[PDB]
């Protein structure tokens, strides 16, 4: 579930190096670059291509 | 790298 419709949703994103899920919210979507801005619980931020990420809602 | 630690 990607695209502009994901904005506003709380998701957990898989970081392979830590073998961990980290919780955040999708704050925006860049249509041209197909990028989501994820703001994490712990203050981290990532600009992500979610289609090549392991991640899940909830 | 993409790690918290």
Author numbering:
A (entry chain A): 602 to 659
B (entry chain P): 1 to 5
List passages from the publication reporting this PDB structure:
In plants, RNA-directed DNA methylation (RdDM) is a well-known de novo DNA methylation pathway that involves two plant-specific RNA polymerases, Pol IV and Pol V. In this study, we discovered and characterized an RdDM factor, RDM15. We show that RDM15 contributes to Pol V-dependent downstream siRNA accumulation and interacts with NRPE3B, a subunit specific to Pol V. We also show that the C-terminal tudor domain of RDM15 specifically recognizes the histone 3 lysine 4 monomethylation (H3K4me1) mark. To further investigate how RDM15 functions, we analyzed its protein sequence and found two domains with known functions: an N-terminal ARM repeat, which is known to mediate protein–protein interactions, and a C-terminal Tudor domain, which functions as a histone mark reader. Our biochemical and structural results demonstrated that RDM15 is a reader of H3K4me1, and revealed a hydrogen bonding interaction-based mechanism of recognition of lower methyllsine marks.
The crystal structure of the RDM15 Tudor domain in complex with the H3(1-15) K4me1 peptide was determined using the SAD method and was refined to 1.7 Å resolution. Although a 15-residue H3K4me1 peptide was used in the crystallization, only the H3A1 to H3Q5 segment of the peptide exhibited well-defined electron density and was built into the final model. The Tudor domain of RDM15 exhibits a canonical Tudor domain fold with five β-strands forming a twisted β-barrel structure that resembles the structure of other Tudor domains. The main chain of the H3K4me1 peptide has a ‘U’-shaped conformation such that the N-terminal H3A1 and the C-terminal H3Q5 extend out away from the peptide-protein binding interface. The side chains of H3R2 and H3K4me1 form a pincer-like conformation, thereby anchoring on two adjacent negatively charged surface pockets of the Tudor domain and highlighting a significant structural and chemical complementarity. In detail, the H3R2 inserts its side chain into a negatively charged pocket and forms hydrogen-bonding interactions with Glu647 and Gln654 of RDM15, as well as a salt bridge interaction with Glu647. In general, both H3R2 and H3K4me1 are specifically recognized by a hydrogen-bonding network and electrostatic interactions involving their charged side chains, as well as by an aromatic cage that captures the methylation modification. Mutations of residues of either the aromatic cage or of those involved in hydrogen bonding interactions with the peptide resulted in a significant decrease in the binding affinity, revealing that these residues are critical for the recognition of H3K4me1 by RDM15.
